Amino acid sequence: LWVTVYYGVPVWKDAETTLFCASDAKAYETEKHNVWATHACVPTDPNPQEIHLENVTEEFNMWKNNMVEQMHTDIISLWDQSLKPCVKLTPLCVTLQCTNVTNNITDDMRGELKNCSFNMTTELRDKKQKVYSLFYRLDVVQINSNKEYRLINCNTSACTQACPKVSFEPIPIHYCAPAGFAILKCKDKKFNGTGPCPSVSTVQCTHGIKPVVSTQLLLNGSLAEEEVMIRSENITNNAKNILVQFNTPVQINCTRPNNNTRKSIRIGPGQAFYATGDIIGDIRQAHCNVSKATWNETLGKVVKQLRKHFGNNTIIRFANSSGGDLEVTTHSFNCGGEFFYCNTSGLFNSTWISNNDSITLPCRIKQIINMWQRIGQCMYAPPIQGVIRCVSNITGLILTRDGGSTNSTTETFRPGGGDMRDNWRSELYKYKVVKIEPLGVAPTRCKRRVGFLGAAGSTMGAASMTLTVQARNLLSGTVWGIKQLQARVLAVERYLRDQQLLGIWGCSGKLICCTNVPWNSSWSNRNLSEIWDNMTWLQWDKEISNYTQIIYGLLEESQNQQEKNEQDLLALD
Amino acid sequence: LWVTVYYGVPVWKDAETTLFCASDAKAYETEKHNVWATHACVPTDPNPQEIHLENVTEEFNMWKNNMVEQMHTDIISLWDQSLKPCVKLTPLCVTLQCTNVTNNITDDMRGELKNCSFNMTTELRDKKQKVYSLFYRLDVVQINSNKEYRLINCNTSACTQACPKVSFEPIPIHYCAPAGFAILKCKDKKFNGTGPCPSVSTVQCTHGIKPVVSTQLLLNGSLAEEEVMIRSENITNNAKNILVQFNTPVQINCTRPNNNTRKSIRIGPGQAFYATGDIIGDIRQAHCNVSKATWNETLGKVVKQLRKHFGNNTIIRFANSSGGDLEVTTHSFNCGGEFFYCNTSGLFNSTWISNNDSITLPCRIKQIINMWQRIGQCMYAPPIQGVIRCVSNITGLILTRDGGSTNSTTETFRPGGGDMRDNWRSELYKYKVVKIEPLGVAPTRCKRRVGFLGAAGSTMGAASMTLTVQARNLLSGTVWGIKQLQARVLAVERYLRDQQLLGIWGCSGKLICCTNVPWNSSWSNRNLSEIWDNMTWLQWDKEISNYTQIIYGLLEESQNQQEKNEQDLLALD
Amino acid sequence: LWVTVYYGVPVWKDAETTLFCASDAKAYETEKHNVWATHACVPTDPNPQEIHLENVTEEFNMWKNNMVEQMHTDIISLWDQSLKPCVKLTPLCVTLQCTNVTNNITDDMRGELKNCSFNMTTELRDKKQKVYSLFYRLDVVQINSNKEYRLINCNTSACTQACPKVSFEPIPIHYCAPAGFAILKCKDKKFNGTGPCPSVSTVQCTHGIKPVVSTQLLLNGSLAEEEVMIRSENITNNAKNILVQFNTPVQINCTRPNNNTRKSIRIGPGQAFYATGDIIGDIRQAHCNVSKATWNETLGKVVKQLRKHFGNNTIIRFANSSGGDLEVTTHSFNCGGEFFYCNTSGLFNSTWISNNDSITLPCRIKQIINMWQRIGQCMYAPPIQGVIRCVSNITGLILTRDGGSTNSTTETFRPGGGDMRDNWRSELYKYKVVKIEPLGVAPTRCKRRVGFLGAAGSTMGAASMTLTVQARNLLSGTVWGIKQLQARVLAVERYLRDQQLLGIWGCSGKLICCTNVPWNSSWSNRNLSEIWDNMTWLQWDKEISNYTQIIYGLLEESQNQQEKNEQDLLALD
Ligand SMILES: *[C@@H]1O[C@H](CO)[C@@H](O[C@@H]2O[C@H](CO)[C@@H](O[C@@H]3O[C@H](CO)[C@@H](O)[C@H](O)[C@@H]3O)[C@H](O)[C@H]2NC(C)=O)[C@H](O)[C@H]1NC(C)=O
Ligand SMILES: *[C@@H]1O[C@H](CO)[C@@H](O[C@@H]2O[C@H](CO)[C@@H](O)[C@H](O)[C@H]2NC(C)=O)[C@H](O)[C@H]1NC(C)=O
Ligand SMILES: *[C@@H]1O[C@H](CO)[C@@H](O[C@@H]2O[C@H](CO)[C@@H](O)[C@H](O)[C@H]2NC(C)=O)[C@H](O)[C@H]1NC(C)=O
Ligand SMILES: *[C@@H]1O[C@H](CO)[C@@H](O[C@@H]2O[C@H](CO)[C@@H](O)[C@H](O)[C@H]2NC(C)=O)[C@H](O)[C@H]1NC(C)=O
Ligand SMILES: *[C@@H]1O[C@H](CO)[C@@H](O[C@@H]2O[C@H](CO)[C@@H](O)[C@H](O)[C@H]2NC(C)=O)[C@H](O)[C@H]1NC(C)=O
Ligand SMILES: *[C@@H]1O[C@H](CO)[C@@H](O[C@@H]2O[C@H](CO)[C@@H](O)[C@H](O)[C@H]2NC(C)=O)[C@H](O)[C@H]1NC(C)=O
Ligand SMILES: *[C@@H]1O[C@H](CO)[C@@H](O[C@@H]2O[C@H](CO)[C@@H](O)[C@H](O)[C@H]2NC(C)=O)[C@H](O)[C@H]1NC(C)=O
Ligand SMILES: *[C@@H]1O[C@H](CO)[C@@H](O)[C@H](O)[C@H]1NC(C)=O
Ligand SMILES: *[C@@H]1O[C@H](CO)[C@@H](O)[C@H](O)[C@H]1NC(C)=O
Ligand SMILES: *[C@@H]1O[C@H](CO)[C@@H](O)[C@H](O)[C@H]1NC(C)=O
């Protein structure tokens, strides 16, 4: 009959907000190399809390998530911030004099290293300096008695050498939302990227996400749980990348067996340039090894789950990439500072039908890079002395279907990728951000006299006793610097708005503040047995969400003001 | 009689604060390249509300407004931000060797364009490049086989090319104040600039203001109603500009018949310099057209209002600009990218005794500009390819009077301008920012036991029923980015201070409350019928403004502390 | 028996927070623009409030004061900010060719002023310029038939010319604590800098302190009272400085008799380089003067007050500095823009046994400078034309004890300094920041039915009637603005946390409230009369902070939740 206002109901709606980084601050409390990304984040909770929701079935969507875009923008801005402070190599674009290096009489790499020598400025503007350095063939381009060259990007973009002190080591970060927002987590083991997730769990924020950069194979990412899953925006469409994820890792070992040496040239006053001085001992190519039997078994599995969608009689035949830029055409990870670019033509060999030492990947290195498909600004990665070795493990792939015929007697899958959002979407697949609103109104028989969300799936009557748990922690009282400020300002304003709305009414209280506005039959007149015993809060929100504004207006104006002026006139005499 | 505290009365008072931007969704969603000003402006509400205050009369002042200065600072800051991130053109200073253009036939514009050639640097620091470009006569100065010149600014300032993609296209901007403030709006049809406006209305924020930059003639402005209103700070003083506002607009057309060509010179790495390569076909001077009959009629209408201020039978005479810099001597503006500088001696030339064709304005174009009289921050607008044409309205003038004696036989009005504040002040003449304060105290016979401003003109008895409406909107739950954040924080702060000051008294959760403070007769006591039925809250607060601190001190000391301590002593048994 | 929560109670504890500047408007209104970026600082309070606290004893310490480090960081940041828009002199690193003092007659100083002639780029790229300048012997280092030199730091740092408009003139800076905090001012006459101060006071803003710079002598410092004070972290440790603060000042006059003239050389466009053109008249030595009798008397006082720690009849000896950099070896300072560097060996040249016109100190001047022992950043102070004279007051030394022994026979003292924290620490020795904690709990017999800090020393019974004054003040109503914004948001967040924590309990009504938690005897049981009337509020915080968290837990969980769970039954009707 009479309206009653409830504060702290289990209700949420989809929204987007400014997330802030959290990371393990104890590891870097003792200072180390100034990492590219992870600094100034709030310390992470030593005991993260994950709460399971009893009966809810939330709808997820991988390919229209906003956290991926926020992550990509954050990484781009962090990289741009990192590159700015240190040296600019504007005076290095000069005509070079380059000849082939003479290794320690070992062949098959003779044409790849140059010994460019050139003129460079010095401290005093009136004088010039004569220097030399070693450049890779992919870094230096010809300009048309030994022939003379220039750097590759002199006619496109400038160069800012990376600050030698920082380190491009990926290390995990946690994206945490402001107070008043919650991040759901799809939990079932067969989530194909879209559709309902019958198992859901609320977490304050995420686990450790390593911002690894790669094009053709995903490295160090999170594995699947039950089986190797295949995800795509629309599998039937050939234009959409077919992300894949493994359940057991395939180990890849990469090396640069050259005893490189750094050599600093001054281009001062103050500024210095680090050249590739000289290589000691033999010179050999950089190669990556992947176990043959393990890779064969992994592909023989992926083809098995891949035939679930494309029929169980078709012929599946992998192949190397079609072509394009060197980033797209070759697996382009980074290992300790050097930016490899490796072939992968030996991996994607097979032709499957219904019925042992290693695989070597010969490859090459480039020092100058302009990643994220950008133009107008490049970077010069300084050389790293000594042999460098990495042991990653392949966790997923990025496939693309040819779709070259309509009969569909066979299918051909060439690996691709290069849009860095695909790497992030492979990790943020089981998250979304929701906006908790704690206020609610429902009819009852009042007349006023003169887990964190574990009750979400329960009926409205069952959830009418746990109101306090929602409202207890509603406030929870340079990149990563302004984001925290905006996040906490938004949280404070949300708490203040909720308190003001609950205060202008007659309630000023937490649990079950009865009111006096009569229940109009126009606001979905149902039997109270059909309301309290049948429905739940999330369902109760939807049909009445049109009329919440009218009920708020009636409570604030029609009832409280008249009631209080009546009390004031009562105390007159 | 005892004091009673009301929260959310219609009281306001004049104040100055920080405003933020807001733009239309159409301009917000324009996929093309960003406009010079609006990038992070929040989208505007599709339906702003007008809450005409009914019986209120407020004192307006056009000249001493603070919105104008804030707009000027914001515009200058936006320009400086716009020019920072693209090409700097320091190495263009070279001794240029120039020669006249050959024209086509029947030479008429010989001395304006020069065919300058100079040696310019290329990407490779070793080599040099021979190029040529066409510079207008106003952009070069001779130095002492053919003659040689330098650029205009290479002994005062360093050039900086305007970014080639961004366009200085004026578009509407709305300046909206944060929560807890209001922007009143005068609507008197004959508002001359100062004095009380008997018809006052409040909007959430202003109408669309086009930030057009021009001098000597206001373009694309807002027109008056029923009269050709004329405004000035002081008509007797001859050192003050006399703004005008036409009833109906005057159509002005402008053209640049030369068919330019954009020649790209690469002076990298990365940078570039766009040059006026060569002109195709016939070559002629830029000119602007204004209808003769319309302009004659408009002058004949404006002189009638000048006769009112300066008396009947006085002869009003017009004359062209007094002389000085080219910025103020000629009607300067930009039409699609080219900065025109048009002679206006054909318009301001007439004499008016007591009792079909088109006018052609010769015009000249300049490329190197240092607008806003800020020497040291020059700019080089790149050439715009193809014929340029635009059609605009003239909706105002900026006249100045001649002060040679008075002996009022006649007056001589000469156009002026140059200070850009007058362009903004012509649009923001019907607004001012007033901060709303909700708290208030008034007497009555009660003692305690032991539209958004539509009621601003109503009596205190009727106004006390609308405390909810006033009290609701006190939170409303790059340069613009920090403006919005600071304004939001300020609003939250003011609301929290109001809440705390209400809470130290015994009236925390209530809009109205009775208190046991006696009403001292020294506070201008009056019969209740003369307060609650013969006064309004704005008029009441104007009377008790001296005793507010004493009453607040009494309420916080004599009542709450003593009451709580005595109640604590009572609860012991 | 029962617990009762008190809000707004005079209790504080040590804490650190970012402070904000406050300077008078006259400094900005001075014609010398941007002397210290006064626009950043807030206008000063016209009447700072000092409230005497009558019974409080507080533990002071200056050797761990955080305000010293905050002032140092603020000064460094302001200095770096000031020079950013100024000219950069990278093209000045040229092979100079210098030949002593050929243009003038000089006394026996001989080769201190080098007459340097060298090439330079004119306002145009094409043509070079032949110019000259006078550089001091300290500003040029030889490089290997007239000899040739270069500037001192052409292989270390890039000079940036000081802007000529601004001047490095110190002005008062007032430090004001943000909302919620307070600054305690110790007023004891004989305060050593450590231990309990029995005459504490409080101030909203500190007294005006001038950020002077000088190594071996403190200039314009604040004077002590009634005796020369000696302060040290541990006097018997040889490695720690021993500050001194004279009772009465010793005046020092300094002069630059050379009559310099400024020559403006153009490095255009938009850049100028001010050289030392020529010296009119005879070359003469720069020197400083100190009164002999006054200085001898001051050292006679310092020995009297410094033998107190060491011995009544121990030999104490003074001596000049040992060696090292010119900054530490010699008393440096600025005198009207010229950075003097004067040896003080004519002053510390005394020996004192167990039981006549003026001291003159000739000294040098250096132009290129980089204070704080910084590397990578430098400045070139332009010449100050005309004869220069200064007058200053010495107000404290910075001594240092030698580690040799002679365990008791003799003690040797030398001037020290070099780190600029000591100069700030000599002025902020009587101020520390404290954080106010307004919540408090005390036992009493109440059971619930089913100046700003002048009372900090008074008993709890009397201090319960002044809860309003503390509670009222807690809220207190581009680059470098985010610091103030973050401090402000932090204050708001702290207030909201306190209010929410009070709201979880059954005490939404502010100030003295009562709760039903019994008072366990284990929590420092005392008879009630000796709790309320034989003890103060600060001492109560020193005997509950162990159990305060558990008391808050009992209040928030054990009583209010059960009360609501009992109330829900009666809420149905
Ligand atoms: C006053 O407002 C008028 C709006 O009518 C301004 O004229 C407009 O100027 C723009 C920019 O030149 C014109 O758009 C351009 O059109 C050309 C094609 O001619 C196109 O190639 C460009 O990319 C751009 O879209 C626009 O057509 C023109 N308006 C009209 C009706 O022609 C005028 O510039 C304003 N006054 C001042 C002083 O800015
Ligand atoms: C997924 O992509 C496929 C493209 O193959 C879409 O299927 C096409 O739909 C159009 C429109 O009806 C037909 O003309 C084509 O013949 C279809 N192609 C095939 C191979 O069947 C499909 O609609 C897309 N799915 C979604 C949900 O967008
Ligand atoms: C990729 O696959 C092709 C065939 O699919 C491989 O070519 C085979 O090489 C072996 C070894 O000489 C021959 O015995 C076969 O006859 C070849 N097959 C065909 C169809 O000609 C090729 O070597 C593979 N390359 C890599 C790098 O894995
Ligand atoms: C200044 O004199 C005081 C004694 O009056 C010394 O301070 C004492 O220091 C000890 C050591 O920490 C403390 O336990 C005492 O409480 C302090 N008492 C007082 C009154 O401050 C201090 O050491 C002297 N300073 C110097 C530099 O010698
Ligand atoms: C102050 O400094 C002195 C000297 O540095 C310290 O005294 C020394 O203490 C060690 C440890 O017992 C002895 O081995 C030395 O012989 C002492 N030297 C002298 C000269 O006394 C003293 O401990 C320091 N005091 C404080 C409070 O730090
Ligand atoms: C610093 O200079 C001042 C003058 O500007 C000196 O003060 C003067 O000294 C002379 C000689 O003793 C007196 O005749 C004047 O009356 C003094 N003038 C004033 C205003 O006091 C001062 O002695 C100099 N100090 C030093 C250390 O040389
Ligand atoms: C400051 O003055 C003293 C005293 O004149 C200078 O000390 C000289 O030191 C050198 C090296 O031992 C010797 O010439 C003498 O011992 C001292 N000179 C005289 C005349 O006795 C000191 O060099 C001066 N400071 C500077 C930076 O030169
Ligand atoms: C505008 O009108 C007011 C009267 O309301 C008058 O005081 C003022 O001088 C007028 N100003 C002008 C410029 O006409
Ligand atoms: C007293 O109140 C009456 C209301 O009926 C009013 O008419 C009268 O003017 C008042 N007199 C004074 C002195 O305020
Ligand atoms: C400059 O003066 C110094 C000091 O007397 C002297 O050693 C030097 O030889 C002089 N320079 C020349 C060029 O004579």
Author numbering:
A (entry chain B), B (entry chain A), C (entry chain C): 34 to 141, 150 to 185, 187 to 309, 312 to 321, 321A, 322 to 398, 411 to 505, 521 to 547, ...
Q: What do the study authors state?
A:
Subsequent engagement of the Env-CD4 complex with the CCR5 or CXCR4 coreceptor moves the Envs down the energy gradient on the entry pathway, culminating in the formation of a gp41 six-helix bundle that facilitates the fusion of viral and cellular membranes. HIV-1 envelope glycoproteins (Envs) of most primary HIV-1 strains exist in closed conformation and infrequently sample open states, limiting access to internal epitopes.
To gain insights into the structural features of the incompletely closed Envs identified in this screen, we determined cryo-EM structures of 1059-SOSIP, and for comparison, of the well-characterized BG505-SOSIP. Both the 1059- and BG505-SOSIP trimers were purified using Galanthus nivalis lectin (GNL) chromatography, which exploits lectin binding to Env surface glycans in a conformation-independent manner, followed by size-exclusion chromatography (SEC). We obtained cryo-EM reconstructions of unliganded 1059-SOSIP, resolved at 3.6 Å with 737,588 particles, and of BG505-SOSIP resolved at 3.7 Å with 975,399 particles. In comparison, and consistent with the lower range of protomer motion observed for BG505-SOSIP, the 3D variability analysis of BG505-SOSIP, revealed no significant opening motions of the SOSIP trimer. We analyzed symmetry of only two SOSIPs purified via GNL under identical conditions; we expect that analysis of SOSIP Envs of additional HIV-1 strains, which are planned for future studies, will reveal a range of asymmetries that may relate to the ability of different Envs to “breathe”.
